[PDB]
């Protein structure tokens, strides 16, 4: 049973669609557990400056109380059958998923229907929840990677809804009344923009009939006329530096415009990203890792941890790197990291491209291990691509990637493109934006 | 007198010719080099600061 044989044997992703529009998608297997969740297309992108932070508030109040389950009773039902209920809200998607046994499927779907629909939104709990978010804002302020990435988004997509943080400024969260949230729920928690996903010991017919008998009350209209449209977001190459010398370590994230969820150029670029690799001070590979940047960093003890990212939204993305290093390394990595990118833009050997392809295949096949990652994959893919990409298709697209393709796509996205630097901490040594932009092009090429 | 002026300054005509070319080259270059200077410095000219003490 070779790799290829296993790929065309992975269960399918049967997809259905009720009349209201809610797309039901399941993925049967043999495990006695399951993971059923609803992936809505809410997020900070669909939020104006007046109500930014509504999605976070709604996610907070989702599990608090319902009309049918008054409150803690919902938590009691979730805990009595051993299910773990979770929710994650991002800049584009917001989802609720219950991790429960296969036998508890009829009850779990009912619980998700109650949350996404008959949410109480009691004013007393709103007031209680108002402080919690404020505390969580300070906690996130302590999370230096998160604040650096929020700086990245703010300075890259400036003047666009994407620049808005998911949690929202700590002024909107102090005025968000019940009225603002109710419009968010009635305007974004709609059936067409919803995917009921499940994976594990789930039967697609069972999921379809449970959806028909529970989520039928979901509405597809948009009240009077208001249909929140998709606003394309401009990427304005800029920089932001919040220099705080008290911070022990300096975080710098630099990213250029990457593609959207469409534009198969993601597959080559990811391979290119895999060639750059990722490093942490506790790796153990040392001065032997195949990635040139990782080997240099380990040899000279340059950084504490650098990671390459390919954050991808519907029409644009932030493709680049983020590294954590001391005060007297920030410039040096700016030399090497950029020096790495241009190498892939001018001379990418087939050997390292094969290595990147293998790394990408491993990442994809490993990330889809376990019911919860599979459910997340289904819910995210149905919203981004409109269909779950089978692993065989991923394998084919990876196979079509070679050295010339990587060079072309990198030169198309990396070469001579203004970056979106964002730095925090003792970032004095961080090269000036003109120096970074100059480093974005090579005088040999 | 004109002949003696030529005797003292045989390069007069070519001096003025090179001066003409010099004028045209500087009129073409100085605006362009100034534009490059503005291009490079515009990062700093539009730089906006902010103070956020605790
Ligand atoms: C560094 C290079 C110069 C950078 C820019 C600064 C100098 C001014 C340039 C703009 C004004 C002059 C432009 C020019 O070339 O004008 C034409 C003139 C010659 O005109 P003409 O005699 O009619 O000949 C035409 C056919 N060849 O030619 C000139 O007028 C030439 C300019 C005057 C001479 C002084 C130039 C600067 C000093 C010398 C720099 C080079 C040093 C080389 C050292 C020796 C190398 C072996």
Give the chain B residue nearest A437 (alpha carbons).
B40
Q: A139 to chain B, minimum CA–CA distance in Å? A: 15
Give the chain A residue nearest B51 (alpha carbons).
A242
Resolution (A): 3.5
Query: Would you state the structure tokens that stand for residue A386, as one six-digit string?
Result: 């409109």
- Known catalytic residue at A59: yes
**B45 close contact with A: CB closer than 8 A:** no
Query: Would you state the structure tokens that stand for residue A291, as one six-digit string?
Result: 């990635």
Pocket (CB within 6 angstroms of ligand 1): B 17-18, 21-22, 25-26
Query: Would you state the structure tokens that stand for residue A410, as one six-digit string?
Result: 């990198």
Longest dimension (CA), chain A: 69
CA–centroid distance, residue B20 to ligand 1 (Å):
12
Print the SS3 string covering chain A.
CCHHHHHCCCCCCCEEECCCCCEEEEEECCCCEEEEEEEECCCHHHCCCCCCCHHHHHHHHHCCCECCCCCHHHHHHHHHCCCEEEEEECCCCEEEEEEEECCCHHHHHHHHHHHCCCECCCHHHHHHHHHHHHHHHHHHHHCHHHHHHHHHHHHHCCCCHHHCCCCCCCCCCCCCCHHHHHHHHHHHCCCCCEEEEEEECCCHHHHHHHHHHHHHHCCCCCCCCCCCCCCCCCCCCCCEEEECCCCCCEEEEEEEEECCCCCCCHHHHHHHHHHHCEEECCCCCCCCCCCHHHHHHHHHCCEEEEEEEEEECCCCEEEEEEEEECHHHHHHHHHHHHHHHHHHHHCCCHHHHHHHHHHHHHHHHHHCCCHHHHHHHHHHHHHHCCCCCCHHHHHHHHHCCCHHHHHHHHHHHCCCCCCCCEEEECCCCCCCHHHHHHHCCCCCC
Q: B42 to chain A, minimum CA–CA distance in Å? A: 10
**A432 close contact with B: CB closer than 8 A:** yes
The Cβ of residue A406 has, within 10 Å, a number of other Cβ atoms equal to 24
Identify each DSSP E strand in chain B by its residue range: none
Which of A49, A59, A171, A203 is the catalytic position? A59
Method: cryo-EM
Distance CA A46, CA A111 (A): 26
Candidates A198, A242, A227; CA nearest to A96 is A198
Output the CA torsion A210→A213→A215→A217 (10° steps): 180
| Contacting A residues, span 167-186, partner chain B, CB-CB under 8 Å | none
Q: Is B1 helix (H, G, I), strand (E, B) or coil?
A: coil
> Given ligand 1 and candidates B17, B22, B30, B32, which is best to mutate, with the most ligand atoms within 8 Å of its CB?
B22
- Strand pairing report for A317-325 and A303-312: antiparallel
User: By the 8 A CB rule, do A256 and A414 touch?
Assistant: yes
Half-sphere exposure of A325 (CA within 13 A, CB side): 29
* Mutation target among B38, B39, B43 for the A interface, most CBs of A within 10 A: B43
Candidates A124, A135, A123, A130; CA nearest to A174 is A130
């Amino acid at each position: 049973a070779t790799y290829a044989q296993a790929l065309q044997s992975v269960p399918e992703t049967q997809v259905s669609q009720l009349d209201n529009g809610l797309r039901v998608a399941s993925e049967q297997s043999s495990q006695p557990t399951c993971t059923v969740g609803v992936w809505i297309d809410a997020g900070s992108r669909y939020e104006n400056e007046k109500n930014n932070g509504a999605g976070y508030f709604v996610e907070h109040l989702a599990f608090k109380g319902t009309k049918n389950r008054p409150g803690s009773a919902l938590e009691k039902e979730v805990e009595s059958m051993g299910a773990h209920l979770n929710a994650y809200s991002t800049r584009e998607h917001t989802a609720y998923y219950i991790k429960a046994l296969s036998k508890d499927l009829p009850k779990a779907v009912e619980l998700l229907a109650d949350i996404v629909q008959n949410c109480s939104l009691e004013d007393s709990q709103i007031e209680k929840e108002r402080d919690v978010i404020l505390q969580e804002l300070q906690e996130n302020d302590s999370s230096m990677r998160d604040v650096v990435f929020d700086y990245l988004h703010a300075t890259a997509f400036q003047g666009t809804p994407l620049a808005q943080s998911v949690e929202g400024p700590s002024e909107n969260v102090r005025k968000l009344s019940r009225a603002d949230l109710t419009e968010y729920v009635s305007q974004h928690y709609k059936a067409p923009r919803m995917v009921l996903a499940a994976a594990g010991g789930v039967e697609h017919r069972q999921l379809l009939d449970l959806a028909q008998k529970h989520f039928s009350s979901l509405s597809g209209t948009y009240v009077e006329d208001a249909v929140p449209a998709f606003t394309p977001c401009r990427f304005t190459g800029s920089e932001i530096r919040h220099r705080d010398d008290a911070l022990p370590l300096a975080h710098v994230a630099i990213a250029v415009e990457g593609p959207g969820w469409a534009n198969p150029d993601n597959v080559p670029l990811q391979v290119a990203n895999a060639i750059i690799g990722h490093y942490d001070s506790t790796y153990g590979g040392g001065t032997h890792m195949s990635s040139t940047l990782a080997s240099v960093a380990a040899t000279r003890k340059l950084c504490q941890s650098f990671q390459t990212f390919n954050i991808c939204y519907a029409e644009t993305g932030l493709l680049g790197a983020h590294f954590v290093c001391d005060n007297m390394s920030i410039d040096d990595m700016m030399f090497f990291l950029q020096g790495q990118w241009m190498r892939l833009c001018t001379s990418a050997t087939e050997s390292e491209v094969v290595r990147g392809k293998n790394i990408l295949r491993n990442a994809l096949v490993s990330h889809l291990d376990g019911t919860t990652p599979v459910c997340e994959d289904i819910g995210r893919s149905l919203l981004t691509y409109g269909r779950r990409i089978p692993l065989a298709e991923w394998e084919s697209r990876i196979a079509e990637v070679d050295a010339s393709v990587v060079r072309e796509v990198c030169s198309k996205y990396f070469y001579d493109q203004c970056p979106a630097v964002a730095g925090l901490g003792p970032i004095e040594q961080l090269p000036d934006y003109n120096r970074i932009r100059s480093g974005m092009f090579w005088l040999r090429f | 007198c004109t002949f003696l002026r030529w005797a003292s300054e045989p390069e007069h005509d070519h001096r003025k010719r090179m001066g003409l070319k010099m004028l045209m080259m500087m009129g073409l270059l100085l605006p362009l080099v100034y534009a490059m200077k503005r291009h490079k410095w515009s990062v700093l000219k539009s730089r906006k600061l902010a103070y956020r003490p605790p």
